[PDB]
Amino acid sequence: MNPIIYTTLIMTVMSGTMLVMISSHWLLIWIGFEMNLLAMIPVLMKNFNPRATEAATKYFLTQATASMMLMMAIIINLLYSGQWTITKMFNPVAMTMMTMALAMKLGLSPFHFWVPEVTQGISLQAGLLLLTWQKLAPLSVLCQISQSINPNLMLTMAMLSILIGGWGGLNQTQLRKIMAYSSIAHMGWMTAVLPYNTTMTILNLLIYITMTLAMFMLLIHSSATTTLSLSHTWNKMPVITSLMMVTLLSMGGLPPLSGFMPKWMIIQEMTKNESIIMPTLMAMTALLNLYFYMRLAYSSSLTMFPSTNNMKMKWQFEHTKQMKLLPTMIVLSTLVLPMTPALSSLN
Amino acid sequence: PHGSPDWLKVGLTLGTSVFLWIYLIKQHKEDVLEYKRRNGLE
Amino acid sequence: NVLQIVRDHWVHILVPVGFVFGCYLDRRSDEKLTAFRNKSLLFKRELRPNEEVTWK
Amino acid sequence: TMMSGRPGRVPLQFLPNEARSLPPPKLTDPRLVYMGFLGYCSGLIDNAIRRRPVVSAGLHRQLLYVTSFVFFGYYLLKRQDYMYALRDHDMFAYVKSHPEDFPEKDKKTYGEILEEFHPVR
Amino acid sequence: PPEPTIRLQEDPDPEDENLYEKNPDSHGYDKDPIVDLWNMRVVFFFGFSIVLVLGSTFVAYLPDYRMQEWARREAERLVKYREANGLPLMESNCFDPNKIQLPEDED
Amino acid sequence: MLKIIIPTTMLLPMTWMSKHNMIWINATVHSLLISLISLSLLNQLGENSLNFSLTFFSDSLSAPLLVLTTWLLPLMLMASQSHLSKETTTRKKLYITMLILLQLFLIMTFTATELILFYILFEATLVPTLIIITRWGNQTERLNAGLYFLFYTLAGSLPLLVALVYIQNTTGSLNFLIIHYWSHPLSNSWSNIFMWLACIMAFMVKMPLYGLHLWLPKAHVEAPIAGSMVLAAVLLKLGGYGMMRITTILNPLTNYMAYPFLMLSMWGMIMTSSICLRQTDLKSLIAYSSVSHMALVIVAIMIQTPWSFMGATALMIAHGLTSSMLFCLANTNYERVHSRTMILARGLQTLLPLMATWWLVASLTNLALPPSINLIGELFIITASFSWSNITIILMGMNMMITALYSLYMLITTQRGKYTHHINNIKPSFTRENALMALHILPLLLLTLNPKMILGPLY
Amino acid sequence: LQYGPLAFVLGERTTRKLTETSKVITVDGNICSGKGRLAREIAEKLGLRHFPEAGIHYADSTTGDGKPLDVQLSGNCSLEKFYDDPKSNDGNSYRLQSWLYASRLLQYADALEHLLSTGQGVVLERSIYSDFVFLEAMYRQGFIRKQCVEHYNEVKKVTACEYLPPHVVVYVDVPVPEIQSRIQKKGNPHEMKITAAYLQDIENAYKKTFLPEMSEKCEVLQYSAREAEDAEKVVEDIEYLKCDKGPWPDQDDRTFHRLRMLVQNKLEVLNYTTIPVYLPEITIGAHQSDRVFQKFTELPGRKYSPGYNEDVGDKWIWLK
Numbered sequence A: 001m002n003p004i005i006y007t008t009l010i011m012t013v014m015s016g017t018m019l020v021m022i023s024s025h026w027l028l029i030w031i032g033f034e035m036n037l038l039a040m041i042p043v044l045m046k047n048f049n050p051r052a053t054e055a056a057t058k059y060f061l062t063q064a065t066a067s068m069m070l071m072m073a074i075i076i077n078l079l080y081s082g083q084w085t086i087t088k089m090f091n092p093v094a095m096t097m098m099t100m101a102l103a104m105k106l107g108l109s110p111f112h113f114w115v116p117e118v119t120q121g122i123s124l125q126a127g128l129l130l131l132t133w134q135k136l137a138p139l140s141v142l143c144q145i146s147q148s149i150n151p152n153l154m155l156t157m158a159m160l161s162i163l164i165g166g167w168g169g170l171n172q173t174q175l176r177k178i179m180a181y182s183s184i185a186h187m188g189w190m191t192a193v194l195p196y197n198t199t200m201t202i203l204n205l206l207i208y209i210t211m212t213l214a215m216f217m218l219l220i221h222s223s224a225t226t227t228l229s230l231s232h233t234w235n236k237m238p239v240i241t242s243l244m245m246v247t248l249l250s251m252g253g254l255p256p257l258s259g260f261m262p263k264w265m266i267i268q269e270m271t272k273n274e275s276i277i278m279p280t281l282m283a284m285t286a287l288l289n290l291y292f293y294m295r296l297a298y299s300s301s302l303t304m305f306p307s308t309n310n311m312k313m314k315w316q317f318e319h320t321k322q323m324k325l326l327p328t329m330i331v332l333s334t335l336v337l338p339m340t341p342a343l344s345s346l347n
Numbered sequence B: 001p002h003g004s005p006d007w008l009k010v011g012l013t014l015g016t017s018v019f020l021w022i023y024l025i026k027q028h029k030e031d032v033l034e035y036k037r038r039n040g041l042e
Numbered sequence C: 001n002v003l004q005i006v007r008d009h010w011v012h013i014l015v016p017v018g019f020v021f022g023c024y025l026d027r028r029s030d031e032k033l034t035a036f037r038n039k040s041l042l043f044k045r046e047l048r049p050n051e052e053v054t055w056k
Numbered sequence D: 001t002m003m004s005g006r007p008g009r010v011p012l013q014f015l016p017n018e019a020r021s022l023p024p025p026k027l028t029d030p031r032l033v034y035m036g037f038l039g040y041c042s043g044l045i046d047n048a049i050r051r052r053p054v055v056s057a058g059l060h061r062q063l064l065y066v067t068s069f070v071f072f073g074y075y076l077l078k079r080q081d082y083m084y085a086l087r088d089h090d091m092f093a094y095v096k097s098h099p100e101d102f103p104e105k106d107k108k109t110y111g112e113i114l115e116e117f118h119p120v121r
Numbered sequence E: 001p002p003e004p005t006i007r008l009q010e011d012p013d014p015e016d017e018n019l020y021e022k023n024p025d026s027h028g029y030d031k032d033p034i035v036d037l038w039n040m041r042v043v044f045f046f047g048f049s050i051v052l053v054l055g056s057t058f059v060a061y062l063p064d065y066r067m068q069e070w071a072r073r074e075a076e077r078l079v080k081y082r083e084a085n086g087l088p089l090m091e092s093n094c095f096d097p098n099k100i101q102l103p104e105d106e107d
Numbered sequence F: 001m002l003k004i005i006i007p008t009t010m011l012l013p014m015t016w017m018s019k020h021n022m023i024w025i026n027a028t029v030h031s032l033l034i035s036l037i038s039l040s041l042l043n044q045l046g047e048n049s050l051n052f053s054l055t056f057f058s059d060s061l062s063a064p065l066l067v068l069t070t071w072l073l074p075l076m077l078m079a080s081q082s083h084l085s086k087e088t089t090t091r092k093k094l095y096i097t098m099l100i101l102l103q104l105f106l107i108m109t110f111t112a113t114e115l116i117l118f119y120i121l122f123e124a125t126l127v128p129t130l131i132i133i134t135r136w137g138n139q140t141e142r143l144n145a146g147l148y149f150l151f152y153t154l155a156g157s158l159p160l161l162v163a164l165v166y167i168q169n170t171t172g173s174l175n176f177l178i179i180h181y182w183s184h185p186l187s188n189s190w191s192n193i194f195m196w197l198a199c200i201m202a203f204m205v206k207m208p209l210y211g212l213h214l215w216l217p218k219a220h221v222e223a224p225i226a227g228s229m230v231l232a233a234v235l236l237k238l239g240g241y242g243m244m245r246i247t248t249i250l251n252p253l254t255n256y257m258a259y260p261f262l263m264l265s266m267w268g269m270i271m272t273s274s275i276c277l278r279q280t281d282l283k284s285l286i287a288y289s290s291v292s293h294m295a296l297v298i299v300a301i302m303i304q305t306p307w308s309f310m311g312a313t314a315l316m317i318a319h320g321l322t323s324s325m326l327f328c329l330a331n332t333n334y335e336r337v338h339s340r341t342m343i344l345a346r347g348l349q350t351l352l353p354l355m356a357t358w359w360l361v362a363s364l365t366n367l368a369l370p371p372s373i374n375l376i377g378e379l380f381i382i383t384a385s386f387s388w389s390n391i392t393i394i395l396m397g398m399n400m401m402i403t404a405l406y407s408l409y410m411l412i413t414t415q416r417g418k419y420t421h422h423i424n425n426i427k428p429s430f431t432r433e434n435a436l437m438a439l440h441i442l443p444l445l446l447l448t449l450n451p452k453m454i455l456g457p458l459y
Numbered sequence G: 001l002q003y004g005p006l007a008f009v010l011g012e013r014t015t016r017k018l019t020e021t022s023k024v025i026t027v028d029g030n031i032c033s034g035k036g037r038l039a040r041e042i043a044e045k046l047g048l049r050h051f052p053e054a055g056i057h058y059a060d061s062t063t064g065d066g067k068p069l070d071v072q073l074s075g076n077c078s079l080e081k082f083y084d085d086p087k088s089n090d091g092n093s094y095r096l097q098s099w100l101y102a103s104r105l106l107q108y109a110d111a112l113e114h115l116l117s118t119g120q121g122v123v124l125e126r127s128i129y130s131d132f133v134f135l136e137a138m139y140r141q142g143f144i145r146k147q148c149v150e151h152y153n154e155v156k157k158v159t160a161c162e163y164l165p166p167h168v169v170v171y172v173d174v175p176v177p178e179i180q181s182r183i184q185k186k187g188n189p190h191e192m193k194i195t196a197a198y199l200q201d202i203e204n205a206y207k208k209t210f211l212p213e214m215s216e217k218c219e220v221l222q223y224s225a226r227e228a229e230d231a232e233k234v235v236e237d238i239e240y241l242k243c244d245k246g247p248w249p250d251q252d253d254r255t256f257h258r259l260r261m262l263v264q265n266k267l268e269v270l271n272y273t274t275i276p277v278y279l280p281e282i283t284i285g286a287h288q289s290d291r292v293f294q295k296f297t298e299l300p301g302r303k304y305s306p307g308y309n310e311d312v313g314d315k316w317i318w319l320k
C-alpha cells in the first residue's frame, strides 16, 4: 500500500493500544480494542495473497468474538453494580467472561488454535508486529484487574498454554509456527504469575518482547521461513547464524543468558506463596521448548548443511537496507542477567 | 559504493556524545551537592 | 626494533595488567570490610605509639 | 508488595522529588561499567553485522553507543535505588506502627537449650 | 538410468599430512619451523622450569597457617601441667557442667 | 580472588587480538602464568576459610580443584593444537574462547559464597561444553550425545533451583557460612524427603550415579580431546563438590535416605568395572572406569565421615589427572590410526617405546599402586566404608581386582604382542605429546610427597 | 538519499519520468544470428541504452571492479565443456542453464531499475522470457533430466511472476542450414560441434511455445535475415505500433514504487534462485562450499563492504 497509509495505520494500531492503556472507563477500553482490530487487518493483508486473506479473516473472527464477550462482561458488571471504572470486577460471572475474552485476545490455551495459522499466513513483519505489540493491551487489562481473577482458572490456562506450546513446537518445520508456539508458551509463563505479582508479568513481557524482536529481525535479515532455507544461511552470513544460535540458547532459558531471568524470578515469587508443584511442572515443560530450540540451532549453525551453486551470486551482493536496533536487541536479549535487580523500577 | 567520510554525521555523533557526557557530569555534581544540602553533611 | 615489534607484541602486556588490576581491586574490596578491625575479642589489642590500624 | 497504589505518588514521574535525598550512584559504579560494556558489545555486533572491521570501523558510533548506555544506566540505577529505599522505609514504618505483630523474642543461650543429637555412624 | 550416481559436488577426502616429511626436527607444534621451535621452547620453559619447579618449591616451603607445631606445643605444655598437678589428662566433658542448665523432667 | 579472575578474562582480548600464527603460544604462556598465581591459594588454614569478600571465598576443598582447573587449560591447548591445524583463524579463536569461558565459569563456581550464584555458574558451564562437543566433533552421533548431556543435567538440576529458592524463603539466607552456622535438623517428613531428593539428584546425575550414567559414554566418546579432558577432569567433580557443600543441611535425613544411592553405587562400581572388561573402544573403557571411580566417590560422600571426605577429595584430584592422561594417550593413538578401536593397532611398544612407558605409568596410577594418591583416597574410603559396615570389604576387593584386570588388559592389548602388518603410518611420537604426558604425570608423583594439600578441610 | 518510502513520500514519483519512449524491448534469435547487431542498432537510433547479452560473468561486471572472477568462484560452469561433452557426468549442462537463467534475472532487474530510475528505455537480448528454449532443446536432446526441467520451471515461476513483460519483442528468423554455415564461418572450434538436431529443437521451441504466448500480451515483429539488415524500417515499425494490450498501461505510481523497491536490493531479486531442493547437478557439499567461500572471502576487495577495504586503498576507515 501507500507508505502514508501504512504509517497512518500503524499509528492507529499504536494509538488504540495506548487508548486501552491510559483510559479508566470500560467503554473506552472496548473502543481501543475495536480501533486496534480495525487498523490491524490491512497490516496483516499488506502483501495480498490467498494465505494472508485467510489469516486475516481467521484473526478478525477470533478478535470480534473476543470483543463481543468483553462487551458482554462489561454490561453484566454494570448490571450488578453501576460502575464503569476498571477496578474490582464485582461479579463472579462477569469475571469469568472477561477472563475468557482476554485469553482469546492473547491466544492462551485452549484458545490458542488461531495463533499458528495466523502467523503462518502473514509475512514476517506482520508476524513480528502481531506477536510483539498485540500483547500489551490485554496483558495491561489483566494486570489492572489481577486482584479479581480466580487463581484456579488463570493457573489452569497458563499451564495448558505452556504444555500446548511445548508439545506443538516439537512437530514444526516452519519457523513462523515455531515462533507462534513459543509465543503461546511464553504467554502461559506470563499469566501464571498475575495472581501473585504483576511486576514479574511485566518483566517477563519485556524480556520476551526483546528476544522475539531479535529473533524476527534476524529471520528477516536472512530471508528464510523454513528450516532448510535457514540451513543455507551459514554459506553467506555465518555471523548471523552464530548470533541466532546465541539468541536461541537465550530463548530456551539457559543460564547465564537473559532468558533465564523471567523463569527464575517467577519461580522464586511463586515459591514465596507456598506454591511448589506448578513451578516444577513449568520448568519440566519448558524443557520441550529448549529441545526444539536446540534442534533449530543444530540445523542452523552447529552443523553445515549442503548448499547450492547459485549462492555464488549472493556472495557478491550486500543488503541494501540495514535494520536499526538489531544489535541492541541482541545484546539486551543476551547479556542483561547481571542487571537483574533493576526490576525494582516497576518496569 | 564510493563515499567520503560523511563529516555532517560524524560531527553530529561526536557532538551528541560530548553533550551527553557533559550533561551527565553536571547532573551528577548537582545531585551530590543537593544530597549533601538535604542531609546537612557539608 | 622499537615501534615495530610493539605492534605485534603489545598483546603480551594484557594478562599481567589484569593481574595487577585484580590485586588492586581485591585490596579495594578489602577496604570495605573494616567494621571489626581491632574489635575482635580474640585479637583486641592496644595500638602501637605509631599505629593507626592493626591491619590494612 | 505492589506499590502502584501507594499514596502521594505521581502518575508518570521517573524520579520523584523525594528521591533526591539519597546519595547518587558514583560514576565508577560497577553497574555503570557493565552498562558501558553492554554498549561496547552492541557497537561490536553492529560492526560485525554490517560486514565492517569489527574492532576499528566506527569509533564515533561505538562512542555514541557506550555513552547512551551509560546515561540510561545511570538514571535506571537512580530509580532502582529509590525504589529499594521506599521498600525499606515502608517496612520499617509498618514494623514500628504494629508492635504486637513483631514481638521481641526472649533471648536465650545455647547452654540452656536442649537440642537433639543425631550421631553419624 | 542416466543418473551420474553422484549425490552432490563434494571435495575428495584429503590425505593426512606428515609434519616430518617437509620438516625434520618438527617437534609436533607447528608447520612453520620458527614458530614451532619457539612454541616448544616456551612450553618447556614456562611449564617445567617455571611452574613445575618454582611452584613446587613454593608449596614445599609454605608457612604453617594450619598451625601444627603450635598445637604440638600447646599439647606439650598442657600435658606437662596436668601430669605434674595430678589432673587426669584430658577431661570427658568438653564444657564445664556448671554452665549447662539441664531441663528438669519431673516424670 | 579477582587476581585470578581478571587475567582469565583478559585472556579473551589477548586471544582475539593475537596474530594468526601466535594464538597457541600466547594462550599457553599466559595460561601457565595464571596457574602459577593459583598456587598461592593452596596455603590454607585449619580455621574457617579464606573469605576474600562477600562474593567469593576459598577453602582447602576448593583450592585443589581451582589449581587443577587452572592447570588443565594449557594441557587442553597443547592437545587441541594438532587436530585443528586445517581450521580458519576465526574458528580456532572461537575454540580458545570457549575453553577460556569454561575455565572462568569453573573458577567462579568453585568459590561461590552464595548458593544461587553457585547454581548459575554450575549451569553456565553447560553451554561452552555443549558447543565444543556439537561443533568440533568428528562423528555424526555428537548431536545426540550433546542432547543427552544437556537434558540429563537439566532434568536433574531444575528441581534444585526450586529447592534452593524454597530454602532461602524459609531460612532467609543461602550464604554458605550462615547456612553452616544456623543449620537445623530435618524432620522425617515426606516434604523433607522430597526436598532432600531435589537437593541431591542434581549432583547425583553429574557424578554420574549408576543408572543415570548413560550420558557420560556418549559425551566422552563423541567429544574432541580437550572436551574429553575437561569433562573427565573437572566437570565430574562439580557434583561431588556440590554434595559436600549441601549435605550440611540434609542431616539427620541422610542416614536413611542414602541407602538407595549407596546400594546403587556399590553394585554399579562392580557393574562398570566388569563392563570395562568387554569393550572394543578405548574411550568407552576410560569413561566406564571414570564411572566406577565416581561411584566410589559417591559412596564416600554418602558415608559422611572425616575419612570419607578426605578420601573423596584425594580420589577426585587423582582421578581427574589420571583420566586426563589416559584420554590424551588414546587421542595420540587415534590421530595416527583414525579408528578408535583397541584391536586394530597392536604391539605399539616395539614402535613407540617412550609412549609405552607413559601408558604403563598411567595404567599403574589408574590401578591405584601405592603410594600414589589414587590409593590414598581408595584406602581412606575403603576404611571408612568398613567402619560403616564390615561387609563392604567384599565389594571393595572385587572392584579393586577387576580394576587391575581391565587396566592391565588395556595396557597389554595395545602395547604388547605383534604389530599389525598393514599399518605403516605410525610416525615417531612428537615432543608435544611427550611433554603433554610428562606434564600430566609429574604433578601426581609430586603431590604424593605432600598429600595434606589434597586431603580437604577435614585434615 | 537512496530511494525508499521517504523519497516516495516527499518527491520521488517515476510516472512523470515516462516520456512514451521507455518501451523496454527484447530481441530474440537462434545461435549465430544477426540479432546482436540488430539490437545494438535499435538502441542507437532510438537513444535507448543497450544491454549486451548476459553471460557467465555478468554479475562480476557489476560488483567491485568490472573484471570477472575465477570460474570456480563464479558460475562453476563453462560453455566450452557443454559444447564438447553435452552429456558430461558432473552435471555441467543444467548448472550452466541455471546460472545463465539467474544471470538473465539479475540483468532484467538491472534494466528495470535503470528504466524506472531515469526513464530512458533499454534494449535486451534473450531475457528471462524465452530462456526456456535452450532448456527445452537440451531436454529433447537428452542432455538433461526431467527433474532438472521441473526445478527450472519452479524457479522460473517463482521468480518471473513479479516483473512486467517487455513492450515489444523482436525476432530475427534464420534458416538452420544458413545458421550452420554461419557457425562454420565463425571459426570457433567448440561451436563447430553443435548438431543440427539441437538447433532444430531450439527453433521449434521458439515458434511453438514462445511466439503465440507473447503475442497475447505483447507486440511481436517477426523479421527475416534480409529485412533485418536495414534498421530504419525496424525503428519505423517500433514507433508506428502503440502498446495498449499489455499490463504496462494498467500500472500506476504505487505499483511503480513497489517494482522499484523490488528491482533494487538484488538479494531479494535472487532470493528464490537458491531454493532448498537438492538436485545433484547443482547441490554442493559442505566441505567444498566452505573451502570455496573462504577463498572468495580472501579476494582483494571482498572481505568487507565495498567502502571498508584498506587493501584496495579505502581510507578513513575508522570514521566511516
Ligand SMILES: CCCCCCCCCCCCCCCCCC(=O)OC[C@H](COP(=O)([O-])OCC(O)COP(=O)([O-])OC[C@@H](COC(=O)CCCCCCCCCCCCCCCCC)OC(=O)CCCCCCCCCCCCCCCCC)OC(=O)CCCCCCCCCCCCCCCCC
Pocket: A238, A239, A242, A243, A246, A256, A301, A334, C014, C017, D040, D041, D042, D044, D045, D048, D052, D053, D054, D055, F009, F013, F016, F017, F090, F091, F094, F097, F101, F104, F127, F128, F131, F135, G297
Ligand atoms: C562472562 C562474561 C565475560 C566475557 C563476556 C563474553 C562475551 C564477550 C563479547 C560479547 C560480544 C561482543 C563482541 C562480539 C562481536 C562479533 C564479531 C566477531 O565475530 O569477531 C570477529 C572479530 C575478528 O574478526 P575480523 O577480522 O574483524 O572479521 C571477521 C568477521 O567478523 C566475521 O568472520 P567470518 O564470518 O569469516 O567467520 C565466521 C564465524 C564468525 O562468527 C562469530 O564469531 C560470531 C560471534 C559470536 C556470537 C556473539 C554473541 C553475542 C554475545 C554472546 C556472549 C555469550 C556469553 C555467555 C557464555 C556462553 C558462551 C556461548 O562464525 C563461524 O565460524 C560459524 C561457527 C560458529 C562456532 C560456534 C559459535 C559459538 C558463538 C558463541 C560466542 C560467545 C562468546 C563470544 C566471545 C567473543 C567472540 C568474538 O573479533 C574481534 O576482534 C572482536 C572481539 C572483541 C574485541 C576486543 C578488543 C578489546 C581489547 C583492547 C582493550 C583491552 C580491554 C581491557 C582494558 C584494560 C587494558 C589496558
Ligand SMILES: CCCCCCCCCCCCCCCCC[C@@H](O)O[C@H](CO[C@H](O)CCCCCCCCCCCCCCC)COP(=O)(O)OCC[N+](C)(C)C
Pocket: A202, A203, A206, A207, A210, A332, A333, A336, A339, A340, A341, A342, A343, A345, A346, A347, D004, D010, D011, D012, D013, D014, D076
Ligand atoms: C530487555 C531489558 C528491558 C529493556 C527495556 C527497553 C529499553 C529502552 C527503553 C528506554 C526507557 C523507557 C522509560 C520511559 C521514560 C519515562 C518512564 C516513566 O515516565 O514511567 C514510569 C515507569 O518507569 C518504567 O516502568 C521503568 C522502565 C525501565 C526498564 C528497565 C527494567 C528492566 C528489568 C531488568 C533488566 C536490566 C536491563 C538494563 C539494560 C536496558 C512511571 O510509571 P507509572 O505511571 O508510575 O506506572 C506504570 C507502571 N506500573 C503500572 C507497572 C506501575
Ligand SMILES: CCCCCCCCCCCCCCCCC[C@@H](O)O[C@H](CO[C@H](O)CCCCCCCCCCCCCCC)COP(=O)(O)OCC[N+](C)(C)C
Pocket: E051, E052, E055, E056, E057, E059, E060, E061, E062, F064, F067, F068, F071, F317, F443, F446, F447, F449, F450, F454
Ligand atoms: C630420572 C632418574 C633419577 C634422577 C633424579 C635422582 C634424585 C631423586 C629425587 C626424586 C624423588 C626422591 C624422594 C626425595 C624427597 C625429598 C623432598 C621432600 O622432602 O620434600 C617434600 C616437599 O614437596 C612438596 O611439598 C610437594 C610438591 C608440590 C606439588 C604441587 C604441584 C605443582 C603445581 C603443578 C599443577 C598442579 C596439578 C594438580 C592440582 C592439585 C616433602 O617435604 P616436607 O617434609 O613436607 O617439608 C618440607 C621442608 N620444611 C619442613 C621446611 C617445610
Ligand SMILES: CCCCCCCCCCCCCCCCC[C@@H](O)O[C@H](CO[C@H](O)CCCCCCCCCCCCCCC)COP(=O)(O)OCC[N+](C)(C)C
Pocket: F188, F189, F190, F193, F210, F211, F212, F260, F261
Ligand atoms: C532409575 C535409575 C536410578 C535413578 C535414581 C533412583 C533413586 C530414587 C529413589 C528414592 C529413595 C526412596 C524414596 C522414599 C524413601 C522413604 C522410606 C519409605 O519409602 O519407606 C517406607 C514408606 O512406606 C511406603 O513405601 C510408602 C510409599 C509408597 C509409594 C512409593 C512408590 C514405590 C516405588 C516407586 C519407585 C519409582 C522410582 C523412579 C521414579 C520415576 C517407610 O514406611 P513409613 O513409616 O510409612 O514412611 C516413613 C516416612 N515418613 C516418616 C515421612 C512418613
Ligand SMILES: CCCCCCCC/C=C\CCCCCCCC(=O)O[C@H](COC(=O)CCCCCCC/C=C/CCCCCCCC)COP(=O)(O)OCCN
Pocket: A274, A276, A277, A280, F152, F155, F156, F159, F162, F163, F166, F190, F191, F192, F194, F195, F196, F197, F198, F201, F205, F212
Ligand atoms: C535425572 C532425573 C532426576 C530428576 C529429579 C528427580 C527428583 C526430583 C525431586 C522431587 C521434585 C520436587 C522437588 C521439591 C522442591 C523442594 C520444595 C520442598 O521441599 O517443599 C516441600 C514440597 O514438596 C512437594 O511439594 C513435592 C511434590 C512432588 C511433585 C513433583 C513430582 C515430581 C516427581 C516425583 C517422583 C520422582 C522423584 C525421584 C526421582 C528418582 C530419579 C528419577 C514442602 O512443601 P510445603 O507445602 O511448603 O511444606 C509442607 C507443609 N505445609
Ligand SMILES: Nc1ncnc2c1ncn2[C@@H]1O[C@H](COP(=O)(O)OP(=O)(O)O)[C@@H](O)[C@H]1O
Pocket: G029, G030, G031, G032, G033, G034, G035, G036, G053, G079, G096, G097, G100, G131, G133, G134, G135, G191
Ligand atoms: N540457454 C543457453 N544455453 C547454452 N548456451 C547458450 C544459451 N543461450 C545462449 N548461449 C550461448 O551464448 C553464445 C552467444 O549467443 P549467440 O546469439 O548464438 O551468438 P552472438 O552473441 O554472437 O549472436 C552462444 O555461443 C550461445 O551458444
